[PDB]
Amino acid sequence: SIGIAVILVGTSDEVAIKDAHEKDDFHHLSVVPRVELVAMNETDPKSIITRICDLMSDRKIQGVVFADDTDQEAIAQILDFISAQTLTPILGIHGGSSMIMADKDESSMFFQFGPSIEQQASVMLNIMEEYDWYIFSIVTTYFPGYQDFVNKIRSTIENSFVGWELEEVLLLDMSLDDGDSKIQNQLKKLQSPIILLYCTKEEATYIFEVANSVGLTGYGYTWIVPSLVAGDTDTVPSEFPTGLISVSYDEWDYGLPARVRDGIAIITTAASDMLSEHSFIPEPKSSCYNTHEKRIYQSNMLNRYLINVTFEGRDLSFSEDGYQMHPKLVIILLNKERKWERVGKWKDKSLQMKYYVWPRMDDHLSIVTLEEAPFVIVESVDPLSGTCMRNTVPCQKRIISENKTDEEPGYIKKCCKGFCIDILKKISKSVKFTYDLYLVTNGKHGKKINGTWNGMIGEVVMKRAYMA
């Protein structure tokens, strides 16, 4: 006998959603919860309020779940209104993002389900920190979450980033603007390649009209924006270029019925009896018109308990601004036919990328070397970052293994120093170069046996696009 709201989505399978949650055995905790389904598909504020507090007036309701299709603003802030008006816990939402910003003061609320915008920026650095490729651009249009975003990527890009170049670029606001005028002055600086900003889908279609007008669409560039602008769903216009990779947390998240079970478990596990030090009996609210001063003592004890609760290998927790504390993460998705194909999974801090090189990127060379005396020194990697600072060279060494699987060009990129590497870093700037540096495997460098050559000359005679 606890009151749990449902999900009102105008499409889905409420049977799988019912069945998923009803196998979580919440005994050994205090009373057992319950569910009551209803549905709506309209997205105005008034229908939302007169349904939420109608259900509040009928049932002794503890908490509220909600998700409709893919509208973020048409839910957000309205929820912060009803939560602070009712002093009752409310789950995080699907069908809009539960993200972009829980900016109001959660001293009477708190609802959320999602990674923070900075945990997304940290994993966005570690992803581009898998191969090369330091932070290029700055967020140009006005996110409301801009000054924290840039002051966190600035405050981490200096005290712990492995030799990064400058950011000659700033923030404008082309909403009040007449058109393509000040966006023309920012398309010059904007060097190569870049990082895209946080904007809207319609205004991305706008800024891509300006970028197509100047010539930034092809041109050898890539673009990272973490999903919230254009990748909200499986729908994209054809005016998006094939460089427009983007990371989210979700293709198997909230909408899943096991996620629904997880959401049921977070509110329900935080029992009043589980609060053994403060065995208080919750007196739920009557209706959405009064009884707001009765929860002054109850909700503060509840605010401390939602953070790290233990579950059945699914320890979900929230920050003060409502995020995880180990959020569910996905990798960047890319394709070229209207374009999101899945490439990855991230949990704690791992990446386990599907390829060790980015496809779609002649002056690209492979170069094969050998570890030896004062010429090419091979040392191990940093145990916190993987890359190399002074060396700044992959040296993707292959492993010889059992004769049932191929070699390992995903073995960890051992540092390579010496005198020839310092020569190579000058010879690259002398004309125009691009490395693909890797080691020999048979270990028979500079040998001619009966018929053939081995080692570095062995990979010379096999015409493998080489230097030595």
Epitope: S1, K18, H21, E22, K23, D24, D25, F26, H27, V32
Partner: antibody
């Protein structure tokens, strides 16, 4: 899905008779069953959740009763000890809408007797 | 746990009369009600939900009203296939039950 009881008896006065009720999806479905008085009262006997936890009784038969269930064979297990003054009929009842919570069944069993 | 007590002891009525039996629990139930009927040796049949919501296959012969912890349930227009005994259920804590009454025909 249908429920059929078995294991009926009170052949020892004050003994222990493990009765059962098999089902033919019952794994996500909790269980609680019923004895009947000579005044026919559908008094409760025991309580399990669907997941084996939540082992409880009402105040009539507390202190003597050993409780289990098996969702593989879709069966319950509880030995009747303090029905020794009754000529009761027992049936099994599977509450609707599943879960470790409880709702209103139409999914009841068949009905068998327990006699001293 | 919470325990219930129904009352009183009888459904003494003629063909098509009116009797009413009360759910009385030790604690507030918020209209947590059910109603069942069975022959001696046959097995229960559901009547009533939350808002006295009847069942498909169950006629409109059964109605009721009440709230909080006290509920009344009225039976009329009874055909003598309902030689039965009527019982009320509460589930605030895990399950709750009382005495209940049996039906006789005079």
């Amino acid at each position: 899905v249908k429920l059929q009881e078995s294991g009926g008896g009170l052949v020892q006065p004050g003994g222990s008779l493990k009765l059962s009720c098999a089902a033919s999806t019952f794994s996500s479905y909790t269980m609680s069953w019923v004895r009947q008085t000579p005044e026919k009262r559908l008094e409760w006997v025991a309580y399990i959740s669907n997941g084996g936890g939540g082992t409880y009784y009402p105040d009539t038969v507390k202190g003597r009763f050993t409780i289990s269930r098996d969702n593989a064979k879709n069966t319950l297990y509880l030995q009747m000890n303090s029905l020794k003054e009754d000529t009761a009929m027992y049936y099994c009842a599977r509450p609707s809408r599943g879960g470790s919570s409880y709702w209103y069944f139409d999914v009841w069993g068949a009905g068998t007797t327990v006699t001293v | 746990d919470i325990q219930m007590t129904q009352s009183p002891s009888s459904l003494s009525a003629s063909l098509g009369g009116k009797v009413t039996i009360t759910c009385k629990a030790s604690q507030d139930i918020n209209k947590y009600i059910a109603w069942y009927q069975h022959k001696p040796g046959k097995g229960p049949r559901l009547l009533i939900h939350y808002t006295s919501s009847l069942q498909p296959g169950i006629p409109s012969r059964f109605s009721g009203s009440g709230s909080g912890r006290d509920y009344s349930f009225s039976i009329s227009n009874l055909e003598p296939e309902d030689i039965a005994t009527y019982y009320c259920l509460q589930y605030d804590n895990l399950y709750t039950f009382g005495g209940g009454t049996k039906l006789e025909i005079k």
